[PDB]
Structure 1
Amino acid sequence: GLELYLDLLSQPCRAVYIFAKKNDIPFELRIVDLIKGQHLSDAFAQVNPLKKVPALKDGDFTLTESVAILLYLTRKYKVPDYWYPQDLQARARVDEYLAWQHTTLRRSCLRALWHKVMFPVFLGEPVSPQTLAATLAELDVTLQLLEDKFLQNKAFLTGPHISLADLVAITELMHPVGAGCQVFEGRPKLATWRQRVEAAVGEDLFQEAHEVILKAKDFPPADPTIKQKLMPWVLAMIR
């Protein structure tokens, strides 16, 4: 039937996983261990030639990109309208966030995890303090935008109920949280939003989805061969 190729270390994977689980969508979970380079293997290259997760397989149909996967699952499984409302402007707000985040918040949250923790600790690659300072500053800018452009004075990013947008944003923000960054500290509007999102998703599910990213800082350092395999994947990922 439906197979989802995921690693909960990955931000887009957590969004897909939460969404499928919350909506009781049946699927076979296929774990792709990123830390062990399983996405770079010949076996996975058969599933997804792009060598990235998440990937969906629905019979002979294969799909990549978390945004595409989320919208496909929304439509195919007739999930509640609140995820992607029928009103054209409400729907557009979800589309706008989903488009905006690719080059902004997704990038800043990823760079925060890698520059602060995963490079120096896991890959044994020191990061220059100038690079880390620029990364943390950029994260601050993107968090301010999250508040000023999207959330504003609303309960959620696009209106009074959770939507796909909130699911993508929250799993992004958990990346710097795993890195030990001061994300929700000093931002009470984001902190209260997080609690509302966790409630809407289910606290146990939210926690389950985030177990791996919260222990990333404690991964054993990669062997030379794994480091060699992963470097180009990491560098393309963050740019």
Structure 2
Amino acid sequence: GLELYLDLLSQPCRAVYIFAKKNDIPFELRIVDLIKGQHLSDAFAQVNPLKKVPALKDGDFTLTESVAILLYLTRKYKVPDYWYPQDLQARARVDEYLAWQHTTLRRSCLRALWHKVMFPVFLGEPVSPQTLAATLAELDVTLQLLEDKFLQNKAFLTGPHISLADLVAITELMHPVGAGCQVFEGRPKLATWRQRVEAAVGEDLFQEAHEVILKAKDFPPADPTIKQKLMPRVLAMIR
């Protein structure tokens, strides 16, 4: 049957996890622990040769990329049209955001988690104060774009209802939130939007999906072995 290789630490996994639970899509949970390097192992490379999460598997069908996984689940499980509307322009707005976040907001949030908490606390590697400040400055810029280019004065990023776009954006914004960054303080429109999204998702589910990312400042250091294999993996993931 349907299997989902996830790790709620990972941003795209929370987006997929929330989408699957919210829509009651029956899947088998295969928790892949990234804090142990369980993704660089022989047992996981058989599943996904690229050694990454999220990963979907259903028989001989395998799929990577959360954007592909979400669209696939949307179509196969005939979820509500609001996730990805029939209307061509309304649907184009979801694609516009999904294509936009790869190199911008996803990149920012991920760098905020690693340059402010993961390297120093988890990897034990000090980060240049100049690199940390640049990372947070750039986080502010992408937050500003999120409001100016997408949210504007609407209830959600693509219209009056929640869509795949809102789902991917809030799991992205929870990265810096888990790192101690003041993401919504000083941004009333994004704070209003956050409450509308977790209300549409269901507080229990939203809270459940974000338990590991909020304990990020509490993970113990990684022993010399795991750290040696994750270092080049992380450095390549956050540029």
- In structure 1, distance between residues paired with 2:232 and 2:163: 34
Query: 1:169-198, CA deviations, whole angstroms, 9 ceiling, x for partnerless residues?
Result: 000000000000010000000000000000
- In structure 1, distance between residues paired with 2:78 and 2:85: 12
- In structure 2, distance between residues paired with 1:121 and 1:29: 28
Shift of residue 32 of structure 1? 0.2
Q: Give the aligned partner of residue 70 of structure 2.
A: 70
Which residues of 2 match residues 135-174 of structure 1 at below 5 A?
A: 135-174=135-174
- In structure 2, distance between residues paired with 1:232 and 1:159: 40
Shift of residue 218 of structure 1? 0.5
RMSD (Å), alpha carbons: 0.3
Query: 1:175-225, CA deviations, whole angstroms, 9 ceiling, x for partnerless residues?
Result: 000000010000000000000000000000000000000001100000000
Any unmatched runs of 5+ in structure 2?
none
- In structure 1, distance between residues paired with 2:153 and 2:89: 18
Structure 2 SS opposite 1:47: coil
Structure 2 SS opposite 1:43: helix
Shift of residue 114 of structure 1? 0.1
TM-score by length of 2: 1.00
Query: 1:135-194, CA deviations, whole angstroms, 9 ceiling, x for partnerless residues?
Result: 000000000000000000000000000000000000000000000001000000000000
Identity rate of aligned residues, in percent? 100
- In structure 2, distance between residues paired with 1:218 and 1:235: 22
Structure 1 SS opposite 2:102: helix
Query: 1:56-78, CA deviations, whole angstroms, 9 ceiling, x for partnerless residues?
Result: 00110000000000000000000
Structure 2 SS opposite 1:40: coil
- In structure 2, distance between residues paired with 1:54 and 1:217: 23
Shift of residue 233 of structure 1? 1.2
Query: 1:63-95, CA deviations, whole angstroms, 9 ceiling, x for partnerless residues?
Result: 000000000000000000000000000000000
Which residues of 2 match residues 42-81 of structure 1 at below 5 A?
A: 42-81=42-81
- In structure 2, distance between residues paired with 1:169 and 1:73: 18
Instruction: Find runs of 4+ consecutive structure 1 residues off by over 2 angstroms.
Output: none
TM-score by length of 1: 1.00
Structure 2 SS opposite 1:57: strand
Shift of residue 229 of structure 1? 1.2
- In structure 1, distance between residues paired with 2:51 and 2:188: 38
Q: Give the aligned partner of residue 3 of structure 2.
A: 3
Q: Give the aligned partner of residue 84 of structure 1.
A: 84
Shift of residue 50 of structure 1? 0.2
Shift of residue 106 of structure 1? 0.1
Greater share of residues in helix: 1
Shift of residue 232 of structure 1? 1.3
Aligned pairs, how many? 239
- In structure 1, distance between residues paired with 2:90 and 2:52: 31
Q: Give the aligned partner of residue 29 of structure 2.
A: 29
